[PDB]
């Protein structure tokens, strides 16, 4: 057979999911973004390309905050990134509503994890077109 790369939940015969792999290309193709852990915090940074002089400087903000204590930044398909944060924000609100304490960063990572992994399970959705760098300060 061929065309193992046309449908999203499908394993090729080498064990791979080509649509996820192709999503990585959309990411490799995006602008640069990074994270640096310092020894009581973290720092996020990102290159915003200037298409035109007509852009308003300062004003097309690409780093997004979650809850009060978490920063996310992402490279790739920007709308997919935003969608993912909107999810992350519901996920943090639900966690905090029930458990009171603002969501611990590892806990929050696995929330995004599971949701993203979830879009590689079915052929009726498309995998996320972003790599996301995020983090913050929890009680550990």
């Amino acid at each position: 057979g061929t065309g193992y790369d046309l449908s999203n939940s499908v394993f090729s015969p080498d064990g791979r999911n080509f649509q996820v792999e192709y999503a990585v290309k959309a990411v490799e193709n995006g602008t640069t973004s990074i994270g640096i852990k310092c020894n009581d915090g973290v720092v996020f940074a990102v290159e915003k390309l200037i298409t035109s002089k007509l852009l308003v400087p300062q004003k097309n903000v690409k780093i997004q905050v979650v809850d009060r204590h978490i920063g996310c930044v992402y490279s790739g398909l920007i709308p997919d990134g935003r969608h993912l944060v909107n999810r992350g924000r519901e996920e943090a609100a639900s966690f905090k509503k029930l458990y009171k304490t603002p969501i611990p960063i590892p806990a929050f990572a696995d929330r995004l994890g599971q949701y993203v992994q979830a879009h590689t399970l079915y052929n009726s959705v498309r995998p996320f077109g972003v790599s996301t760098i995020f983090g913050g300060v929890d009680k550990n």
């Binding site: 004003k59 903000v61 997004q64 905050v65 809850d67 009060r68 924000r89 509503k97």
Partner: protein, 233 residues
């Protein structure tokens, strides 16, 4: 909630030349048991709004949590959360009044009466009331519970009309409010000596004062009250 359990009494408030003042005792009662003494019913929201709450405390605590989360959400994708697009009083109020009317309309009310006090980014005083039925109104003075009956009368002696608000200083307004708390202490069986008071001034900003006590009480005369009619000793 279909019947309130732990309850807070009167919130009182008035507006003066540059801001507003609002106050409330630190008690949660359980019927006639004065159960919880360390209860803050003033809820500041940003640095330009204080929301004061009476009625059911479990519902108050729910409303607190909604307010925290409104602040959190307004910050999202909002470079001007700390500036031109922070929350105004008028917004927090509309939101609460919406929620109240909605909960009433599903026969499942939040068993509260709330007063939102603040100063609007354009300098203006804000003071509005909403309660469990979704009913709203504004006045130079506002109070819930007993306060409507005893505090308003006194605070209206200071600001009887709109035109008096410019004339009323923050020293005068504050002394008026403190006196009202003393009156309610004397006469509301569901009230406490300890209270909190907050000022929102368009120049000094938000001053929040915890742990006040009613002082300068008169009781001495009580020593000459003997019997209920004809007993002399």
């Amino acid at each position: 909630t279909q019947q309130p359990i732990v309850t807070g009494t009167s919130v009182i408030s008035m507006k003066y030349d540059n801001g507003v003042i609002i106050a409330a005792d630190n008690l949660g009662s359980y019927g006639s048991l004065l159960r919880f003494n360390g209860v803050e019913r003033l809820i500041p929201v940003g640095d330009n709004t204080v929301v004061g709450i009476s009625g059911d405390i479990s519902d108050m605590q729910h409303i607190e949590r909604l307010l925290k989360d409104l602040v959190t959400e307004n910050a999202y994708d909002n470079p001007l959360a700390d500036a031109e697009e922070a929350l105004e009083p008028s917004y927090i109020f509309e939101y609460l009044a919406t929620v109240m009317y909605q909960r009433r309309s599903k026969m499942n009310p939040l068993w509260n009466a709330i007063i939102v006090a603040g100063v609007q980014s354009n300098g203006d005083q804000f003071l509005r009331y909403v309660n469990l039925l979704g009913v709203t109104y504004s006045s130079p003075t506002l109070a819930t519970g007993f306060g409507a009956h005893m505090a308003n009368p006194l605070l209206r002696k200071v600001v009887d009309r709109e035109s008096d608000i410019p004339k009323t200083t923050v020293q005068v307004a504050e002394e008026a409010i403190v006196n009202a708390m003393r009156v309610l202490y004397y006469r509301d069986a569901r009230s406490s000596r300890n209270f909190s008071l907050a000022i929102i001034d368009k120049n000094t900003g938000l001053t929040f004062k915890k742990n006040l006590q009613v002082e300068n009480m008169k009781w001495d005369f009580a020593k000459d009250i003997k019997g209920y009619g004809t007993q002399k000793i």
